[PDB]
């Protein structure tokens, strides 16, 4: 398991040593904030119908009465450009906030704690995640336990004994086509099926699909020991 | 999950074949680029909504050939075969109570919306990828429980799975088992109801019936903003340039340009919002999804009202139904 | 003799798979693999 | 006790494991009924 998650964690340095565009993500937002600065810059160059975008030439070339109506017009088309400049960076914030929020309740959630919500806390059960930090951002690297090698077995929903049926405290039961067994579920893990490791309900007739096996109890054994050494003394008292 | 792709642009929109107005436009600078861009970065992110709510499994999975699973009948769930588009009996409901007002697709209010220059995109998935992502969730959902989330999908019957979730509410196994009849008739009697609920209610679609009309009512309004006058003599360009002199026409199409370029610029806020709430939703979806259908939630409320046992996708025009099953 | 140009295709949605399901069948994992991934959020 | 904790495997795969007696709720009836036993044997001679 420390095998695996070190050489897990290797691929991670091998990932980020390979490729820019993993972090496509928070070079966006750098992206979008530089692109939207230079527009407005770019902007300036606009005239918005004025003689020039140039506003000391307006002051250079007319008079106060006609050169009103020139610089009005450059104001009224800048203005509109900064109006849209804070609509869309408001726009973003609210975009930013939510994947904050998001980021804040994965650093509480996956990191603070274990979770048990599906695909929350990365592709897997979630064991748990360490954050690292990055301009703009986190990255979590999440760890997670996930089943592998799988094999067929058969299967019943509860195993019939004495008349009575069993099913199990935890775990499933399984047979490898001769013998049954319990495990748990999650990993297999197969153990005679007891007294200690099933519980009984009912009677061998409103279960479909239930099976005949043996349940074992472990006091059985030692009672009869017991009844040997008894025995042996009335023997030896005879 | 999602809304209609849009895209417009400044050369048609504020003047249909009109080199005269294409010189005034210039001197408006960047604001065109900025609308596009904006109309595209909202279209981008539909596919994206929609990618991240539906393509969760990295494979098609299917259920046998024999449709046995404990006595819980899945038959309006499960796609039909013998339809063209291959989905479900209760998705074909959802995709006749839903109406679509423009599929976008090769070429009414359709027709004038484009005259305009204002077009609609169609989405990356066609309406057949969507069944085939829900129906592979669902043949992962009843043949392999939520271990197809967290790994391969390892089969399991399923009266065990449904013993399982009972143990994941706190009752035991064994009574389920006890009442697997009563369950199953239950669960399948409740799928009855659902395509009477569906089938009579009208308004039962209305979250998705909301953002098609809304979709429709934008590009109607802003449309029929081209009729406005914004302060000159006429709303029709060449009438303008027929009865003015080129000193005065120019101006009288700057207002026209100014105007509609408001119109453009409100169409365009009104849609970056309209965008913002619709990923809010596709989030949401996306994580319904993942621990609803995935798995089993202890989240109250989150999976419907009740004690979450497990939940089935369905597709709809532009959205998702969850089928939430609660002890 | 080949050379690189645009295709276009209709997009593969992912790998086809049946699932084994039966009346009493069930897989169980017989080892694991723990994994590591990156999640990046703005 | 027996109660308390589960059994698996044997003491050489695990790190860090440590020697201590783990009780078994069943010896005091078993080791009572062993001297009750005794008793009806030596009373019996
Ligand atoms: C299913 O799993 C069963 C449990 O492992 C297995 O049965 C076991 O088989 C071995 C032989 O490979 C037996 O080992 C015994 O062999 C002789 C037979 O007398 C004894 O002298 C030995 O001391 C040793 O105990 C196991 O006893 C036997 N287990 C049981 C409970 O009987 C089956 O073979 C497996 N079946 C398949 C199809 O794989
Ligand atoms: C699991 O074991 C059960 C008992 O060990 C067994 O129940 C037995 O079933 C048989 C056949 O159904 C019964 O046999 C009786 O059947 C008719 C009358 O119904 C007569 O023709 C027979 O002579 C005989 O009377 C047994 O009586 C019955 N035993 C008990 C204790 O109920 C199950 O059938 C076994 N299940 C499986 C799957 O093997
Ligand atoms: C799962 O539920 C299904 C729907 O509740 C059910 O299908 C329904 O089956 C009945 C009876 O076979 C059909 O009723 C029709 O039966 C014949 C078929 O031609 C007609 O002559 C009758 O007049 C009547 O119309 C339903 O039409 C049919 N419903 C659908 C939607 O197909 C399945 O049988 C159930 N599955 C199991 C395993 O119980
Ligand atoms: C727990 O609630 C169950 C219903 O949710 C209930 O099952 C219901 O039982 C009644 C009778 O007890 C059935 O009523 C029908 O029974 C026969 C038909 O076989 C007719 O003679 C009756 O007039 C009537 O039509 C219901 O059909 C049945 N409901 C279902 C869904 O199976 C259980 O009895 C309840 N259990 C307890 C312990 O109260
Ligand atoms: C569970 O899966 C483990 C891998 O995820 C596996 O461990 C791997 O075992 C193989 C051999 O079975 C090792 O391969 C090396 O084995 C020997 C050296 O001991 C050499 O002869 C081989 O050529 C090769 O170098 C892997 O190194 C090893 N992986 C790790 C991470 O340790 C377990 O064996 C599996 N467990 C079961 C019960 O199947
Ligand atoms: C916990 O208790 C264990 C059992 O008492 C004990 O294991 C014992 O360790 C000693 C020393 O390593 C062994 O002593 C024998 O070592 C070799 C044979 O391997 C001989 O050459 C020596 O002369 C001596 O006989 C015991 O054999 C061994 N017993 C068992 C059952 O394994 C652990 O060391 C104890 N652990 C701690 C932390 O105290
Ligand atoms: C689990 O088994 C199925 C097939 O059923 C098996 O049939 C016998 C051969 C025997 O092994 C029984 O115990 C089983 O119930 C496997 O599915 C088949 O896989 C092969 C590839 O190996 C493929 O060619 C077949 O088309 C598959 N058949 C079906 C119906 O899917 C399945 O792979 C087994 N599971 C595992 C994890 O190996
Ligand atoms: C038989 O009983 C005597 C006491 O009467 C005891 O000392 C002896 O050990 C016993 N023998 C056996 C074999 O148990
Ligand atoms: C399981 O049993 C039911 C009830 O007998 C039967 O209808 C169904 O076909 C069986 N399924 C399989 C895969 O054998
Ligand atoms: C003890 O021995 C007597 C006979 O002397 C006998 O009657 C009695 O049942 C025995 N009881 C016990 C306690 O062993």
């Not at chain 1, 650093?107 to 603070?112: I, N, P, T």
């Not at chain 1, 069993?166 to 405290?169: C, S």
């Given at each position: 398991?420390?095998n695996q998650?070190?050489?897990a964690?290797?691929?991670?340095?091998?990932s980020?040593?390979s490729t820019?565009?993993?972090?496509?993500?928070?070079?966006?937002?750098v992206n979008?904030?530089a692109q939207?600065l230079?527009?407005?810059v770019?902007?300036?160059?606009?005239?918005?119908?004025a003689?020039?975008?140039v506003?000391?030439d307006?002051?250079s070339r007319?008079?106060?009465?006609?050169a009103?109506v020139?610089?009005?017009r450059?104001?009224?088309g800048?203005?509109?450009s900064?109006?849209?400049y804070?609509?869309?960076?408001?726009?973003?914030a609210?975009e930013?906030?939510?994947?904050?929020?998001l980021a804040?309740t994965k650093?509480?959630?996956?990191?603070?704690g274990?979770?048990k919500?599906?695909?929350?806390?990365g592709k897997?059960?979630?064991?748990?995640?360490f954050?690292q930090?990055?301009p703009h951002?986190?990255?979590?690297?999440?760890?997670?336990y996930?089943?592998?090698?799988?094999?067929?077995?058969?299967?019943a929903?509860?195993?019939?004994?004495?008349g009575?049926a069993?099913?199990?405290?935890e775990?499933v039961?399984?047979?490898?086509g001769?013998?049954?067994?319990?495990?748990?579920?999650?990993?297999y893990?197969?153990?005679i099926?007891?007294?200690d490791?099933?519980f009984?309900?009912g009677n061998?007739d409103?279960?479909?699909?239930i099976?005949?096996?043996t349940?074992?109890?472990?006091?059985?054994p030692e009672?009869?020991?017991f009844?040997?050494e008894?025995?042996?003394?009335?023997?030896?008292?005879? | 999950?999602?809304?209609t792709?849009?895209?417009v642009?400044?050369?048609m929109y504020?003047?249909?074949?009109?080199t005269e107005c294409?010189?005034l436009?210039?001197?408006y600078?960047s604001?065109?680029?900025?609308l596009?861009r904006?109309?595209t970065?909202?279209?981008?992110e539909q596919?994206?909504?929609?990618?991240?709510?539906?393509?969760?499994?990295?494979?098609?999975?299917?259920t046998?050939?024999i449709?046995?699973?404990?006595?819980?009948?899945?038959?309006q769930?499960l796609?039909?075969?013998?339809?063209?588009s291959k989905?479900?009996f209760?998705?074909?409901l959802?995709?006749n109570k839903?109406?679509?007002?423009?599929?976008?697709?090769?070429?009414?209010?359709?027709?004038?919306?484009?005259?305009?220059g204002?077009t609609?995109?169609?989405?990356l998935?066609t309406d057949?990828?969507?069944?085939?992502?829900?129906?592979?969730?669902?043949?992962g959902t009843?043949?392999?429980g939520?271990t197809f989330?967290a790994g391969?999908?390892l089969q399991?019957?399923?009266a065990?799975?449904?013993?399982?979730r009972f143990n994941?509410?706190?009752?035991?196994q064994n009574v389920?088992?006890e009442?697997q009849?009563?369950?199953?008739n239950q669960?399948?009697?409740?799928?009855?109801?659902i395509?009477?609920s569906l089938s009579?209610?009208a308004s039962?679609?209305?979250?998705?019936?909301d953002?098609?009309?809304?979709?429709?009512?934008?590009?109607?309004?802003?449309?029929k903003?081209?009729?406005s006058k914004?302060?000159?003599?006429?709303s029709?360009?060449?009438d303008?340039?027929?009865?003015?002199?080129?000193?005065?026409?120019?101006?009288?199409i700057?207002?026209?340009?100014?105007?509609?370029?408001?119109s453009?610029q409100?169409?365009v806020?009104?849609?970056?919002i309209?965008?913002?709430?619709?990923?809010?939703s596709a989030?949401?979806?996306?994580?319904k999804?993942?621990?609803?259908?995935?798995?089993?939630?202890k989240?109250?409320?989150?999976?419907?009202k009740?004690?979450?046992?497990?939940?089935?996708?369905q597709?709809?025009?532009?959205?998702?139904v969850?089928?939430?099953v609660?002890? | 003799?080949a050379?690189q140009?645009?295709?276009?295709?209709?997009?593969?949605?992912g790998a086809?798979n049946?699932?084994?399901?039966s009346?009493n069948?069930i897989?169980?994992?017989?080892?694991?693999?723990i994994?590591?991934?990156t999640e990046?959020?703005?």
């Open positions: 398991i420390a998650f070190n050489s964690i290797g691929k991670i340095q091998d980020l040593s820019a565009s993993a972090l496509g993500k928070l070079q966006d937002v979008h904030n939207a230079n527009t407005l770019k902007q300036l160059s606009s005239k918005f119908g003689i020039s975008s506003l000391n307006i002051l007319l008079d106060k009465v006609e009103e020139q610089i009005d450059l104001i009224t800048r203005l509109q900064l109006q849209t804070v609509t869309q960076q408001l726009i973003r609210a930013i906030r939510a994947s904050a929020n804040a650093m509480s959630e996956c990191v603070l274990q979770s919500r599906v695909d929350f806390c897997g059960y979630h064991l748990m995640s954050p930090s990055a951002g986190v990255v979590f690297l999440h760890v997670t996930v089943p592998a090698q799988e094999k067929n077995f058969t299967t929903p509860a195993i019939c004994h004495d009575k069993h099913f199990p405290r775990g039961f399984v047979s490898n001769t013998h049954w067994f319990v495990t748990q579920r999650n990993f893990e197969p153990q099926i007891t007294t490791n099933t009984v309900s061998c409103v279960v479909i699909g099976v005949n096996n349940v074992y109890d472990p006091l059985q009672l009869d020991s009844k040997e008894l025995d042996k003394y009335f023997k030896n008292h005879t | 999950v999602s809304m792709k849009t895209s642009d400044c050369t504020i003047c249909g074949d009109s294409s010189n436009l210039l001197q600078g604001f065109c680029t900025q596009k904006a109309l970065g909202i279209a981008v596919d994206k909504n929609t990618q991240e709510v539906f393509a969760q499994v990295k494979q098609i999975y299917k046998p050939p449709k046995y699973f404990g006595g819980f009948n899945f038959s769930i796609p039909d075969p013998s339809k063209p989905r479900s209760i998705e074909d959802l995709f839903v109406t679509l007002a423009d599929a976008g697709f090769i070429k009414d209010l359709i027709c004038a919306q484009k005259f305009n204002l609609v995109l169609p989405p998935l057949e990828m969507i069944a085939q992502y829900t129906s592979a969730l669902l043949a009843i043949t392999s939520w989330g391969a999908a399991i019957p399923f065990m799975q449904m013993a399982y994941g509410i706190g009752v035991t389920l088992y009442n009849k009563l369950i199953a669960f399948n009697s409740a799928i009855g109801k395509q009477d009579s209610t039962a679609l209305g979250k998705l019936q953002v098609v009309n809304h979709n429709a009512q934008a590009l109607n309004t802003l449309v903003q081209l009729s914004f302060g000159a003599i006429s029709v360009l060449n303008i340039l027929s009865r003015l002199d080129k000193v005065e026409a120019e101006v009288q700057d207002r026209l340009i100014t105007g509609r370029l408001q453009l409100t169409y806020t009104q849609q970056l309209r965008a913002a709430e619709i990923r809010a989030n949401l979806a996306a994580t999804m993942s621990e609803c259908v995935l798995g089993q939630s989240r109250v409320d989150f999976c419907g009740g004690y979450h046992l497990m939940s089935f996708p597709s709809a025009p532009h959205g998702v969850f089928l939430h609660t002890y | 003799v050379s140009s645009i295709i276009a295709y209709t997009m593969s949605l086809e049946s699932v084994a399901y009346n069948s897989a169980i994992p017989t080892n694991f693999t994994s590591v991934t990046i959020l703005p």
